[PDB]
Amino acid sequence: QKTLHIYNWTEYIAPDTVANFEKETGIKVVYDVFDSNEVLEGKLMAGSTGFDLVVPSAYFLERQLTAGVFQPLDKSKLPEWKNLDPELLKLVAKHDPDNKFAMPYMWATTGIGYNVDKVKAVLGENAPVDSWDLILKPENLEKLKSCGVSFLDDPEEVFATVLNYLGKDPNSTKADDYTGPATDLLLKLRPNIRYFHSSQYINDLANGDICVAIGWAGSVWQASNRAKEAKNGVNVSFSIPKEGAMAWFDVFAMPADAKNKDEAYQFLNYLLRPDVVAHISDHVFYANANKAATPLVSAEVRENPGIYPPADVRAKLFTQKVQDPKIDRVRTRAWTKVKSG
Ligand SMILES: [Cl-]
């Protein structure tokens, strides 16, 4: 019997991807899901996970290439590797030099999801939906409070977004940037924020319970699609603001103790087939990292500049850099202070 154990995010594959793979290969796939990066990182560090393929962020990969948690990918077993977009390979390479350990899977940004009609009713037809001003100017958030404002419960992404908005290095290494101006702004915004949570805003956007949220692009586009299918009239959109936004990349990686490597390479090369990953993007509303696949993606998705942004927008995106542990503890303490009154 041939088997393959995969650990991926929830709602990060097409409903029939695994079934199609099993039919084509005769491999028994055990597909498990996690809903938070803390759960994944915890298992990876403990080792002996029993997984042949896992889906970490590229950022986490850099923090583990010296630890040897993953093994290098044999490109000779991945003949369709050439389909991957070289620009995205370069960005991932900043965490995984020479792309030795990770295969780029999907990527997106952290921007603003919003209810089109409610924002325009509160702030006017000319509401600054193309700017972080929509959600980071206190005067605007005070008006939007009643219709619901949510932020991610992710200090790393939120502080980097605030720092960039203030004109500072989004990956600032100065502790006082976090405890001072970044915290000062967040505390001015806090009384207008309904909650900090990294998933509840999907359904709340789709149902009309919140009007503006900091969120992951594909999660917001999923909310927009859920609202359409519900025929409730809720019109959700997403913005990569003009001041820039954090871009991030989820990748497939192979733990060093993977027990079914041959099956894992079959699955990776399966994902490299243009129609396979294009079909996933069609369902999850995330851009994949496969350049050959882009023309096969549904027009509604590939033509959406909030999913596949053009060159001018991509040049405004920043990626997360690793920090010294002191800065990590500073961000955690400051985040608790922001959230607690
Ligand atoms: Cl990343």
Side-chain angles (χ1 to χ4, degrees), residues 56-61 91-92 95 106 108 157 246-251 319-320:
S57 62
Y59 170 78
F60 171 80
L61 216 89
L91 289 168
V92 174
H95 301 289
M106 300 281 156
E157 295 194 11
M246 178 175 296
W248 40 263
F249 319 86
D250 289 324
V251 308
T319 56
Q320 189 177 350

PDB file of all heavy atoms in Angstrom, residues 56-61 91-92 95 106 108 157 246-251 319-320, ligand 1:
ATOM      1  N   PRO A  56       3.985  25.350   5.610  1.00  0.00           N
ATOM      2  CA  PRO A  56       4.315  26.515   6.439  1.00  0.00           C
ATOM      3  C   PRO A  56       4.390  27.781   5.599  1.00  0.00           C
ATOM      4  O   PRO A  56       4.345  27.760   4.367  1.00  0.00           O
ATOM      5  CB  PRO A  56       5.700  26.153   6.982  1.00  0.00           C
ATOM      6  CG  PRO A  56       6.314  25.357   5.882  1.00  0.00           C
ATOM      7  CD  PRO A  56       5.184  24.580   5.245  1.00  0.00           C
ATOM      8  N   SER A  57       4.498  28.907   6.296  1.00  0.00           N
ATOM      9  CA  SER A  57       4.836  30.159   5.644  1.00  0.00           C
ATOM     10  C   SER A  57       6.318  30.164   5.293  1.00  0.00           C
ATOM     11  O   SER A  57       7.130  29.490   5.933  1.00  0.00           O
ATOM     12  CB  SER A  57       4.536  31.335   6.572  1.00  0.00           C
ATOM     13  OG  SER A  57       5.322  31.263   7.752  1.00  0.00           O
ATOM     14  N   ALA A  58       6.668  30.923   4.253  1.00  0.00           N
ATOM     15  CA  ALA A  58       8.075  31.061   3.900  1.00  0.00           C
ATOM     16  C   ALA A  58       8.863  31.690   5.041  1.00  0.00           C
ATOM     17  O   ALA A  58      10.028  31.341   5.260  1.00  0.00           O
ATOM     18  CB  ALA A  58       8.217  31.898   2.631  1.00  0.00           C
ATOM     19  N   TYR A  59       8.239  32.612   5.777  1.00  0.00           N
ATOM     20  CA  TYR A  59       8.900  33.253   6.909  1.00  0.00           C
ATOM     21  C   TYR A  59       9.362  32.221   7.932  1.00  0.00           C
ATOM     22  O   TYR A  59      10.510  32.254   8.393  1.00  0.00           O
ATOM     23  CB  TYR A  59       7.935  34.263   7.537  1.00  0.00           C
ATOM     24  CG  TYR A  59       8.385  34.833   8.861  1.00  0.00           C
ATOM     25  CD1 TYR A  59       9.353  35.824   8.918  1.00  0.00           C
ATOM     26  CD2 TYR A  59       7.830  34.389  10.054  1.00  0.00           C
ATOM     27  CE1 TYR A  59       9.765  36.351  10.126  1.00  0.00           C
ATOM     28  CE2 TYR A  59       8.238  34.910  11.269  1.00  0.00           C
ATOM     29  CZ  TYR A  59       9.203  35.891  11.299  1.00  0.00           C
ATOM     30  OH  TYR A  59       9.613  36.414  12.507  1.00  0.00           O
ATOM     31  N   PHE A  60       8.481  31.288   8.296  1.00  0.00           N
ATOM     32  CA  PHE A  60       8.849  30.267   9.273  1.00  0.00           C
ATOM     33  C   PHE A  60       9.967  29.373   8.757  1.00  0.00           C
ATOM     34  O   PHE A  60      10.742  28.827   9.552  1.00  0.00           O
ATOM     35  CB  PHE A  60       7.620  29.430   9.630  1.00  0.00           C
ATOM     36  CG  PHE A  60       7.926  28.223  10.471  1.00  0.00           C
ATOM     37  CD1 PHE A  60       8.110  28.342  11.838  1.00  0.00           C
ATOM     38  CD2 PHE A  60       8.018  26.966   9.895  1.00  0.00           C
ATOM     39  CE1 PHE A  60       8.388  27.229  12.615  1.00  0.00           C
ATOM     40  CE2 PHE A  60       8.296  25.853  10.665  1.00  0.00           C
ATOM     41  CZ  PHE A  60       8.474  25.984  12.028  1.00  0.00           C
ATOM     42  N   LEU A  61      10.076  29.216   7.437  1.00  0.00           N
ATOM     43  CA  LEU A  61      11.089  28.328   6.877  1.00  0.00           C
ATOM     44  C   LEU A  61      12.492  28.831   7.193  1.00  0.00           C
ATOM     45  O   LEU A  61      13.360  28.060   7.619  1.00  0.00           O
ATOM     46  CB  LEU A  61      10.893  28.203   5.366  1.00  0.00           C
ATOM     47  CG  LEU A  61      11.202  26.823   4.785  1.00  0.00           C
ATOM     48  CD1 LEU A  61       9.959  25.945   4.812  1.00  0.00           C
ATOM     49  CD2 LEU A  61      11.758  26.940   3.376  1.00  0.00           C
ATOM     50  N   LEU A  91      11.236  36.035  -4.366  1.00  0.00           N
ATOM     51  CA  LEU A  91      10.753  36.539  -3.084  1.00  0.00           C
ATOM     52  C   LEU A  91      10.818  35.463  -2.009  1.00  0.00           C
ATOM     53  O   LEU A  91      11.225  35.732  -0.873  1.00  0.00           O
ATOM     54  CB  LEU A  91       9.325  37.058  -3.233  1.00  0.00           C
ATOM     55  CG  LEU A  91       9.169  38.357  -4.022  1.00  0.00           C
ATOM     56  CD1 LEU A  91       7.705  38.614  -4.344  1.00  0.00           C
ATOM     57  CD2 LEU A  91       9.764  39.524  -3.247  1.00  0.00           C
ATOM     58  N   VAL A  92      10.409  34.238  -2.342  1.00  0.00           N
ATOM     59  CA  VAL A  92      10.523  33.153  -1.377  1.00  0.00           C
ATOM     60  C   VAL A  92      11.982  32.862  -1.060  1.00  0.00           C
ATOM     61  O   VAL A  92      12.312  32.460   0.061  1.00  0.00           O
ATOM     62  CB  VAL A  92       9.778  31.903  -1.887  1.00  0.00           C
ATOM     63  CG1 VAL A  92      10.023  30.722  -0.959  1.00  0.00           C
ATOM     64  CG2 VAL A  92       8.290  32.190  -2.011  1.00  0.00           C
ATOM     65  N   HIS A  95      13.802  33.917   2.147  1.00  0.00           N
ATOM     66  CA  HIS A  95      13.730  33.045   3.309  1.00  0.00           C
ATOM     67  C   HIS A  95      14.323  31.666   3.050  1.00  0.00           C
ATOM     68  O   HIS A  95      14.727  30.993   4.005  1.00  0.00           O
ATOM     69  CB  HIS A  95      12.269  32.855   3.739  1.00  0.00           C
ATOM     70  CG  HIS A  95      11.566  34.132   4.079  1.00  0.00           C
ATOM     71  ND1 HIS A  95      11.855  34.863   5.212  1.00  0.00           N
ATOM     72  CD2 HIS A  95      10.578  34.804   3.441  1.00  0.00           C
ATOM     73  CE1 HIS A  95      11.080  35.933   5.253  1.00  0.00           C
ATOM     74  NE2 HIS A  95      10.296  35.920   4.190  1.00  0.00           N
ATOM     75  N   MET A 106       0.802  29.117  -2.581  1.00  0.00           N
ATOM     76  CA  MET A 106      -0.119  30.228  -2.751  1.00  0.00           C
ATOM     77  C   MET A 106       0.488  31.450  -2.077  1.00  0.00           C
ATOM     78  O   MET A 106       1.352  31.332  -1.210  1.00  0.00           O
ATOM     79  CB  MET A 106      -1.475  29.937  -2.095  1.00  0.00           C
ATOM     80  CG  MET A 106      -2.192  28.714  -2.644  1.00  0.00           C
ATOM     81  SD  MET A 106      -3.018  29.044  -4.213  1.00  0.00           S
ATOM     82  CE  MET A 106      -3.094  27.390  -4.894  1.00  0.00           C
ATOM     83  N   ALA A 108      -0.493  35.868  -0.981  1.00  0.00           N
ATOM     84  CA  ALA A 108      -1.489  36.924  -0.899  1.00  0.00           C
ATOM     85  C   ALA A 108      -0.936  38.059  -0.048  1.00  0.00           C
ATOM     86  O   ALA A 108       0.258  38.093   0.284  1.00  0.00           O
ATOM     87  CB  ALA A 108      -2.816  36.378  -0.363  1.00  0.00           C
ATOM     88  N   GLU A 157       1.955  41.152  11.882  1.00  0.00           N
ATOM     89  CA  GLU A 157       1.422  41.791  10.684  1.00  0.00           C
ATOM     90  C   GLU A 157       0.864  43.177  10.989  1.00  0.00           C
ATOM     91  O   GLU A 157       1.029  44.104  10.190  1.00  0.00           O
ATOM     92  CB  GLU A 157       0.347  40.907  10.050  1.00  0.00           C
ATOM     93  CG  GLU A 157       0.871  39.582   9.514  1.00  0.00           C
ATOM     94  CD  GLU A 157      -0.124  38.875   8.608  1.00  0.00           C
ATOM     95  OE1 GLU A 157      -1.134  39.497   8.223  1.00  0.00           O
ATOM     96  OE2 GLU A 157       0.106  37.694   8.281  1.00  0.00           O
ATOM     97  N   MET A 246       1.668  44.110   3.521  1.00  0.00           N
ATOM     98  CA  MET A 246       2.530  42.954   3.698  1.00  0.00           C
ATOM     99  C   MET A 246       2.101  41.840   2.753  1.00  0.00           C
ATOM    100  O   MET A 246       0.921  41.479   2.699  1.00  0.00           O
ATOM    101  CB  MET A 246       2.485  42.445   5.138  1.00  0.00           C
ATOM    102  CG  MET A 246       3.353  41.205   5.353  1.00  0.00           C
ATOM    103  SD  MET A 246       3.452  40.647   7.062  1.00  0.00           S
ATOM    104  CE  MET A 246       4.275  42.039   7.827  1.00  0.00           C
ATOM    105  N   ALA A 247       3.061  41.303   2.011  1.00  0.00           N
ATOM    106  CA  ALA A 247       2.865  40.122   1.188  1.00  0.00           C
ATOM    107  C   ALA A 247       3.449  38.926   1.924  1.00  0.00           C
ATOM    108  O   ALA A 247       4.425  39.050   2.669  1.00  0.00           O
ATOM    109  CB  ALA A 247       3.567  40.281  -0.160  1.00  0.00           C
ATOM    110  N   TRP A 248       2.840  37.762   1.720  1.00  0.00           N
ATOM    111  CA  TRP A 248       3.320  36.546   2.358  1.00  0.00           C
ATOM    112  C   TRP A 248       3.072  35.366   1.431  1.00  0.00           C
ATOM    113  O   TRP A 248       2.260  35.434   0.509  1.00  0.00           O
ATOM    114  CB  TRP A 248       2.681  36.332   3.733  1.00  0.00           C
ATOM    115  CG  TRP A 248       1.225  36.677   3.794  1.00  0.00           C
ATOM    116  CD1 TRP A 248       0.675  37.848   4.237  1.00  0.00           C
ATOM    117  CD2 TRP A 248       0.131  35.842   3.406  1.00  0.00           C
ATOM    118  NE1 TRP A 248      -0.695  37.790   4.148  1.00  0.00           N
ATOM    119  CE2 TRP A 248      -1.055  36.568   3.642  1.00  0.00           C
ATOM    120  CE3 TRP A 248       0.037  34.549   2.883  1.00  0.00           C
ATOM    121  CZ2 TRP A 248      -2.316  36.046   3.369  1.00  0.00           C
ATOM    122  CZ3 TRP A 248      -1.220  34.030   2.613  1.00  0.00           C
ATOM    123  CH2 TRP A 248      -2.376  34.776   2.859  1.00  0.00           C
ATOM    124  N   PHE A 249       3.798  34.283   1.686  1.00  0.00           N
ATOM    125  CA  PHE A 249       3.839  33.145   0.785  1.00  0.00           C
ATOM    126  C   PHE A 249       3.762  31.868   1.601  1.00  0.00           C
ATOM    127  O   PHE A 249       4.549  31.669   2.529  1.00  0.00           O
ATOM    128  CB  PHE A 249       5.136  33.172  -0.033  1.00  0.00           C
ATOM    129  CG  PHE A 249       5.511  34.545  -0.510  1.00  0.00           C
ATOM    130  CD1 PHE A 249       6.252  35.395   0.297  1.00  0.00           C
ATOM    131  CD2 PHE A 249       5.102  34.998  -1.751  1.00  0.00           C
ATOM    132  CE1 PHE A 249       6.586  36.667  -0.133  1.00  0.00           C
ATOM    133  CE2 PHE A 249       5.428  36.265  -2.185  1.00  0.00           C
ATOM    134  CZ  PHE A 249       6.172  37.102  -1.376  1.00  0.00           C
ATOM    135  N   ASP A 250       2.805  31.015   1.264  1.00  0.00           N
ATOM    136  CA  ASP A 250       2.710  29.686   1.846  1.00  0.00           C
ATOM    137  C   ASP A 250       3.332  28.691   0.876  1.00  0.00           C
ATOM    138  O   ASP A 250       3.161  28.803  -0.341  1.00  0.00           O
ATOM    139  CB  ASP A 250       1.256  29.325   2.140  1.00  0.00           C
ATOM    140  CG  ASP A 250       0.683  30.127   3.299  1.00  0.00           C
ATOM    141  OD1 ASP A 250       1.433  30.402   4.264  1.00  0.00           O
ATOM    142  OD2 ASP A 250      -0.508  30.493   3.240  1.00  0.00           O
ATOM    143  N   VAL A 251       4.077  27.733   1.422  1.00  0.00           N
ATOM    144  CA  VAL A 251       4.905  26.844   0.623  1.00  0.00           C
ATOM    145  C   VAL A 251       4.688  25.414   1.090  1.00  0.00           C
ATOM    146  O   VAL A 251       4.297  25.161   2.229  1.00  0.00           O
ATOM    147  CB  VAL A 251       6.399  27.213   0.730  1.00  0.00           C
ATOM    148  CG1 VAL A 251       6.610  28.693   0.432  1.00  0.00           C
ATOM    149  CG2 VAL A 251       6.931  26.878   2.118  1.00  0.00           C
ATOM    150  N   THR A 319       7.754  42.378   2.687  1.00  0.00           N
ATOM    151  CA  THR A 319       7.729  41.057   3.288  1.00  0.00           C
ATOM    152  C   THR A 319       8.343  41.126   4.680  1.00  0.00           C
ATOM    153  O   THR A 319       9.127  42.025   4.995  1.00  0.00           O
ATOM    154  CB  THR A 319       8.481  40.037   2.422  1.00  0.00           C
ATOM    155  OG1 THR A 319       9.820  40.492   2.191  1.00  0.00           O
ATOM    156  CG2 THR A 319       7.774  39.852   1.085  1.00  0.00           C
ATOM    157  N   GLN A 320       7.965  40.165   5.514  1.00  0.00           N
ATOM    158  CA  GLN A 320       8.397  40.156   6.901  1.00  0.00           C
ATOM    159  C   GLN A 320       9.836  39.671   7.012  1.00  0.00           C
ATOM    160  O   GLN A 320      10.231  38.689   6.378  1.00  0.00           O
ATOM    161  CB  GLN A 320       7.484  39.244   7.718  1.00  0.00           C
ATOM    162  CG  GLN A 320       7.706  39.316   9.215  1.00  0.00           C
ATOM    163  CD  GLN A 320       6.734  38.447   9.982  1.00  0.00           C
ATOM    164  OE1 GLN A 320       5.770  37.927   9.419  1.00  0.00           O
ATOM    165  NE2 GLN A 320       6.983  38.280  11.275  1.00  0.00           N
TER     166      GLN A 320
HETATM  167 CL    CL B   1       5.802  34.267   4.366  1.00  0.00          CL
END
